[model samples]
Target: DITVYNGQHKEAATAVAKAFEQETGIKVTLNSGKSEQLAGQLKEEGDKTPADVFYTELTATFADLSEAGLLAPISEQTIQQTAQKGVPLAPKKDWIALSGRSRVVVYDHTKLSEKDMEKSVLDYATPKWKGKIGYVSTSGAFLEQVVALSKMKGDKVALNWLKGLKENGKLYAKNSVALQAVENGEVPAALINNYYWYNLAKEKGVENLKSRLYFVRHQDPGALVSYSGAAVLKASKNQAEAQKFVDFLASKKGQEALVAARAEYPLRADVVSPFNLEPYEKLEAPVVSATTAQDKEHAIKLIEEAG
Candidate 1:
């Protein structure tokens, strides 16, 4: 028996759990909610948590567990076998990435030239792009990216960028809404996760999407990749079963479930994303240290400042 607490991507998480149970005969229970609320609940539950695993779409939440010393060290074999470079960096070894998503800017093709928005995410702050950018301020994903930016560029530069966006950027409540805002041409561009843009285009037809995705500088904070992770709880009554479940999830079958359900980019280097997203290897993501960008307090500050 295993109970999983999932933050964000409820539908995908549910589908995965159902597939896991059907294949493994392991009865799995899932609870899904907003990342912030789930993170807070996990913190409050502490060692007494009934949860056998905590799954999150953002590394920042997993980083919270890592910082609190609540995570158990995952085996080196598991780390090597299950994740990509910079993923599942457990100093004490508590969790590992199940899948990943990259931060991307979605720009309206009709309004903005591809030449004008080639690489840097910082380009949004320039006067030429001011008042034309939209983003979801309430997203933990965005806050984590901001934390990464602050680390790479320093507080002064980060604050200046934040202030500029705050003054000029149109803020939305969710990524989907933000994508819609850009699609409607309310703003020429928006900061969004690659999957949201892809999923929408897949659902509504590509012709309906006025915007196209642009990956930031292709490295580190500029094009930071976030993970959805699975960790065994320290006090889980069924540690063995929990470990087995996680093992099953990292297996090929589990990867396929993700691809089938939500078109998530597989963490396994050999597996291909269902969306044909350049095979993941071709994607130009920067080399980032996971620990540096996983700061909760810093994330909160960006939210406060930008909110």
Candidate 2:
């Protein structure tokens, strides 16, 4: 048995733990928290930390641990289970995505219909959307969007969009607040994680909420699916169990536990997502390599300059 410092949802972590124990007869302890909270502890405790694995929700947070030399690289065979060949799942082989969430355009139907935005992410920059679009300023997800835009488009295009948002878009404390900003009419539309809207819909009941989600296709920056990952700690004495845990997440059965609990997309090509969720291919998400997704300083710098 090994302990996992899972920084995403505990419900899914718990489900993963239970299934692991059931199948292998090895007990697993899962401690869950926000990525920042767990990262802070890992930084403070260093190699002395009891956590045998760090299950990260954000690529930027995973990068922090990677820089600290905290993650133990899994076998090359295990890495293959994470994504398609030649795909980058982490800054290095230190971690691999267990689940993913794409950036999506969201709006309140009572305020704007599908025709209002269509399938383009840039439509928000148009004159009609000025002062009516919102985003979560502090989230790495938003910053990733900036970086992805700069990658697919150019720095000039990404920079201009950030300035446009700063000049016209409303910034919130986080995605949840931004969603409410849309629903309450503070802003008509918002750029947020697909699951944030799903979580809202789950809580409010899908039919009752006025806000709806939209996905853009044809490899737009708006279509980038940012993957969340889990890694084995380099200091773990239980490397075998820790490796098993990471591999479990990469496996089909464990992927099922993940989506069943978190409602996010599974990484495996053979697995299907919930009907409520759009297919990953349908998003036509940009083909971002694993390491390219984690742009720490440049994104924050751009956001600070523009926002």
Candidate 3:
């Protein structure tokens, strides 16, 4: 039996855990909550923690454990199973990514043509996009973008960019809300994960969808790719069971289960997205390591300062 600290939605984690149990004859126990809360708990519990695995979205959360030395290395074979040969998952190999999502601009075709859209995320900060961009500044994905920006161009540049966005961008509760605003022409565009757009298209009929997705696709900060990951706790008494469980997440079956439940890109190269998404190979995301991707605290503060 192995205990999993699930940080994503119950449906996605449940599907993966149930499938693993059926195949391995292992009793899997899940404790679900906010990813950050679980990460804090793991840090507090330390070597006495009961969690065997931590499965969650956001490289930020996984990097928390990676930096704290609470995570054990994932098997090399499991690393190879990930999309893009797994280098983006975790450079240190302390965690294995199970699924991925790309950052994209959701825009209204009626308001702007694809060619008129900015080529980089940073371009949105300029006056040309003033009062036309929507941003859920509180969203984890948004903060991760800031972290990536800080890494690429230094904190000073990242802070200035956020400040520029603060002067120009409108606020929304979430990406879905922002997506609606774009569709209705309330806002010209928004920063969001690609899945949000796909999920909306499924509900509204893809042909009827008023908004379209635009990927910077230039290896820029705006074209960052983030992933969900599984990590084994160093404190776990069931090392073998826990390792097997994490490995299962990188397997073809696990990737299938995850994509079916969440609509995110499968971490495995062999698995295709069900949503007829633009091929992952064609998307050019900037190279950022999990460790450099973590700085949520710094990101939050910069956003506050920018506002």
Candidate 4:
């Protein structure tokens, strides 16, 4: 019996869980909520947690649990076989990247040319981007990426960028909404997850998508790459079964499930994205390690300053 604690992305998670159950007889239950709130609950549960497996939208939250000693060291062999480069880091060896989404600037092509925009995420702070940019402050996804930027770029730069965005930028509660605003020409562009644009284009037709997405500085810190992480709880009574489920999830069958069901890009190199997204190797995520992102204290301070 495995109780999987999840956040947001419930439909996608359910698809993965169903695949896991079919492959193995283990019964998987999902508990979903916002990532931050789920992280807090997992921390409070500690070793007494009924959850055998935990999944979340952002790597930072998983890093939080791993840093707190709530996770077990996943085997080196498992790490090597299951994850891509830079994944399954030490310190708390328990978690592994499940799926990933990149951060991208979605711009209305009619209003701005792809060449006119800055390649670095920090450039959004410049006067040229003012009144042309939009974002969502209410999202943990936004906060997590911002926190990452603050750590890499320092508080002063991050604060100034946030202030400029707040003053000159349009703020939305959801990335989808922000994307729509940009598509409708309400704003010139927006900071959004890459998949949202793809999903929208699929649902509404490519012609309906007025915005074009840009990936900044290939692997730069602000370059859009956020991954969902999966880990077995140290307190899980069904450790063997949980490990089996984890193994199955990282397998080709699991990757196919994600691609077929939600069009999510898999972490595995061999698995092709259904949407024909850029291959994982082609993505230049910031060289920041997941261990570094786990520093919630630093991440929080940056958010406060930005606000």
Candidate 5:
């Protein structure tokens, strides 16, 4: 039996569990919650934690677990299944990327057009977007983006952006709600993961999608590729089963399942990005490595201070 501590969306976690069981006939169970919430539990339980694998929403959370010696190294053979084509895409040998989402501006058709949209995400902080944007106030992904921005553009600039958002941007509890707000004339645009918009489009029909995804190109802070990753726990007796679960996540079979169900971009070179999204290679996203994003707790503090 393999037990997964899932930190991604509940629906996607359930799909992964069901597909893993049907194909391998192995018992797969899930304990799902917010990435930070689950990671904290794993930390509290220490070696007694039953999690065979720590499946995370953000790569930084897995790094948090690994830093405490809670996770074991994943097999290189299992790692080779996915074409992790670049340096930052592969977090470390102990953890691996499964699927990804690009940071983007979700724009309302009534509020913004191509000419009005900015290519850089920072431009959203200016007077142009003041009172015109909805922000996911509690999103870990949003904080990761902030920490990454601090790395790329200096902390002062990134911190100022947060303050700007607080001063003028509307706060949202959820990314989907922020996207919906943009669609329904509550806001002009929202900074969110690309999948949220596509997920909405998938559910309500493409024609009904009043919100359009605006790709913030140029490898800027807004173009961070937030990796959803998996890691094996060091204390689990089911090491081999854990590796199999990790390998399954990086495999084409698993990648396709995510593309079909979650609308996320599969990291495997063999699997195409979902929803006809620009090919993974063409998207100029700067990887938010867990190393750089490690201080997301500090980033959260900065966001709170901005408020």
Candidate 6:
């Protein structure tokens, strides 16, 4: 038995967790919450933390734990199962990427055409897109993108981008709401993960959905292929059992179950995405490693400052 701090999609994580328990007979107690909040709690609890595993939808959260020395090294064999041709693994091997989703423009096709869209994610912050864009400032993935922008373009530029969004963009509470805004023609477009659009289509029926996904090209921050990742907490007494849980997350069985429960692209090369998304190979996302993805404190401060 082991306790898991699961910040991945609740539905998807529950499915995988149930399957793992059935296969291994290992009891999994999942504590669910936002990724950063859970990581913050883990940091505060430290050695006394009961969590044996930490899993989330954002690579940066796993990287944050790995950097703080709160994670145990993942087995190389498990890491190998996570390796995809284009995906970058954890540089320190303390964590492993389990699945992927790219940031995309969810737009109302009737209101705008691909040619009218910004060439890069950064452009969404400018005056041209003012009041026409929708976004979530507090989402883990959005923060990761801000961190990526800071890393690639510098803090000042990133802050200005955030400020631009504050001045020009409509804020939504979450990805699904923002995507719904686009579908209802509340906004011309929204910055969101690719899977949210698919999930919406699944919920509303594809024939009734009016939104379309536009994968931002040219290695821009807008096209980031963020990953969901897992790690074993260093302080866990159940290190072996914890490792097994992390390993199962990267295994073919785990990927299949997770993909079936969620619309995310499977990191395993053998598995494929269920949506009719643009080929993952064709996306030209900016190269940002998990290790240096973000400085959580600084990133949050910037968002606050911009708002």
Off by over 4 Å in 2: 31-49, 59-70, 73-77, 85-87, 90-93, 289-295
**Could you give me the TM-score of model 2 versus the true structure?**
0.84
**lDDT, candidate 1, 5-59, per-residue tens:** 8884877788778888899788888888876687678778888888888777765
What lDDT does the true structure give each of the candidates? 0.74, 0.77, 0.83, 0.75, 0.79, 0.85
Top lDDT model: 6
Question: Over the stretch 37-143, how does candidate 4's per-residue lDDT look in tens digits?
Answer: 87788899998898888877666667678778888666656655546664434455688777777778899998888788886887886788777888887775577
lDDT of 6: 0.85
Which residue pairs show backbone clashes in model 1?
72-93, 72-94, 73-92, 73-93, 74-93, 218-286, 219-286, 220-286
Candidate order (TM-score): 3, 5, 4, 1, 6, 2
Residue-wise C-alpha lDDT for candidate 6, range 186-294, written one tens digit per residue: 9998999888888878777889988988887788888888888888999999999999998898887888788879888777767665665554567776778663433
Off by over 4 Å in 5: 86-92, 291-294
Query: Residue 214 deviation, candidate 4, in Å?
Result: 0.8
The sequence of per-residue lDDT tens digits that candidate 5 reaches over residues 1-307 is 8888888887777787777888899888888887778888999999899989988777767766777878888877766765465424334588887777788888887667989988788878888787998888688678778888888888788889998888778889999889878888988888888888777777788798788887876677887887777889888998988988888888878777777778777777788755767666667777555644346667877887887
Candidate 3 C-alpha lDDT tens digits along 1-307:
9999998878889999889999999989999999889999999999999999998886668776888899988788888887474236565788876777889999998879888788788888889988999988878788888888998989999998898888888889998898899988899888888988998887778789779998888788988888788899989999999999888888888877777777787767777766766656677778876534337678888888887
lDDT of 2 at 277: 75
lDDT of 4 at 30: 94
The alpha-carbon deviation from the true structure for residue 22 of candidate 5, after best TM-score superposition, in angstroms, is 1.5
lDDT for 284 (candidate 4): 72
lDDT of residue 222 for candidate 6: 84
Q: What is the Cα-based TM-score of model 5?
A: 0.89
Q: Point out where model 4 deviates above 4 Å.
A: 43-47, 67-69, 88-90, 289-307
Question: Can you give the lDDT of residue 34 in candidate 1?
Answer: 71
- Point out the higher-scoring one by TM-score: 1 or 3: 3
Prediction 4 global C-alpha lDDT: 0.75
Poorly placed runs, candidate 3 (over 4 Å)? 83-86, 89-92, 291-294
TM-score of each: 0.86, 0.84, 0.90, 0.87, 0.89, 0.86
